[PDB]
Each structure stands twice: as C-alpha cells, then as structure tokens.
Amino acid sequence: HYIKHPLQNRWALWFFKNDKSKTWQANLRLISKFDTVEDFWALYNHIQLSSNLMPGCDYSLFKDGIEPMWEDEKNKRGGRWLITLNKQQRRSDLDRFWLETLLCLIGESFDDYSDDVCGAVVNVRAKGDKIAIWTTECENRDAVTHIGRVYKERLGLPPKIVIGYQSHADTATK
Amino acid sequence: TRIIYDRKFLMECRNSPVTKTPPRDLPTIPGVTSP
Numbered sequence A: 001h002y003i004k005h006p007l008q009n010r011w012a013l014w015f016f017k018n019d020k021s022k023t024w025q026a027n028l029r030l031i032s033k034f035d036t037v038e039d040f041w042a043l044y045n046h047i048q049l050s051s052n053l054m055p056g057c058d059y060s061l062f063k064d065g066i067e068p069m070w071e072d073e074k075n076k077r078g079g080r081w082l083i084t085l086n087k088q089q090r091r092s093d094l095d096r097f098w099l100e101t102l103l104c105l106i107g108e109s110f111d112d113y114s115d116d117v118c119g120a121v122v123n124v125r126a127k128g129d130k131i132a133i134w135t136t137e138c139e140n141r142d143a144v145t146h147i148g149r150v151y152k153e154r155l156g157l158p159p160k161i162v163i164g165y166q167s168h169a170d171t172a173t174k
Numbered sequence B: 001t002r003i004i005y006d007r008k009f010l011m012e013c014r015n016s017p018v019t020k021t022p023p024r025d026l027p028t029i030p031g032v033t034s035p
C-alpha cells in the first residue's frame, strides 16, 4: 500500500562492458528504465557500486530516448562537466559523488536548465575514475554555467578536485 | 509545472518497502546486477 512518487523524466541506466574484441557501441547495454523515485531506489539497491565495476567499465544514466554516446542527436553539439578522481578517491569518494550526481539528475535540480541535461556517466579506469554530466548544447553558455555551478555545490567538491567543461566535438578529436 | 525533489526527500524515499524488490526484468549480469 504505497503510491510511488513520479519523476519529471523517464530515465535509462546503461552499462558498458570492457570487451576489447568488440566495438565500443556493441559493448553498451541497457540495464533498466524507471520513472519514479522508488523505482530508482529499487534499481540502485540491486546493482553493483561503481567502485566495484571491472576496470574499463561504465555506468550511464540518460533520459529515455537519448543514447549515451556523442552521436546521439541530443549529445552531438553538447558537452560534459567532468571530474577526475585519483586512486584513493575511488575508495573514499567515487560512490558518494556518483549517487549525488544521480539525485541531481532525477530530482531536476538545475531549475529550468534541467531541460539541458542529457544524462551522466561514470568511467571506472586504472588511470583515474571519471564522473560527468552531459548537456545538450555546449553553446548554451547560461545553461552550462548554471548546471556546472549547482552541480559543483551539490557534489561538495573540495578545491583539490577541479571541475571542467568540454564539448564532445573536442573530446572526439583528441 | 516541473516535478522537483530535493536531496533529503529522495534519500527518505530509499527506506520505502517498494525499494527492496528488484525491478521485474532486471537482466542477469554477474558482478553487476542482483536479480
């Protein structure tokens, strides 16, 4: 006897399996979709912590209909607010920051500019784990700025962890 | 108008009884999911 609380958006959780035989897109896999708070927690409570993913693997949470790749119409001209962690920060902060990121997404924490958010991505990597929020238009400087500011506040980033914005066009070049 | 939730409320919902059952068609991905 419970009424679930609906989210503004329906979301999809993706997993990326590091298989070097296969193409990047072919390693991408849909786990599940949800559109209530309680379904979010039901999913979260039955998946692995990011810090325990195999090296080279990712989680992505994206709005329904947006694939977690540069090529998607909604990401093409977009970009990301990115933080990179070192090795001790995997243990102490990765899982905390990822969950905080997820709550920013589903809770629509960026006011009107929440419509500019496409999703978020966590990359578990030997060289240093990465968390990012993907936004739809790198040129919407107001949206980008506000999202970045609020996101940095909600994460509670210490100054030793810098947060930076880059367009996917530049990433896909380098 | 937009449905917005702050952190404290989202966290309180985690205790709900509906969050203790996995999603119905959760796939089997050993090490990643617990269906």
Ligand SMILES: C[n+]1cn([C@@H]2O[C@H](COP(=O)(O)OP(=O)(O)OP(=O)(O)O)[C@@H](O)[C@H]2O)c2nc(N)[nH]c(=O)c21
Residues within 6 Å of the ligand: A024, A068, A069, A070, A071, A123, A125
């Ligand atoms: C997010 N993304 C990652 N890849 C591929 O996987 C590679 C690794 O990208 P990465 O996001 O996994 O970073 P990584 O830490 O592994 O290494 P880095 O490039 O030095 O930062 C990319 O260079 C692409 O070949 C991608 N390839 C395509 N076609 N589209 C994407 O959106 C995409």
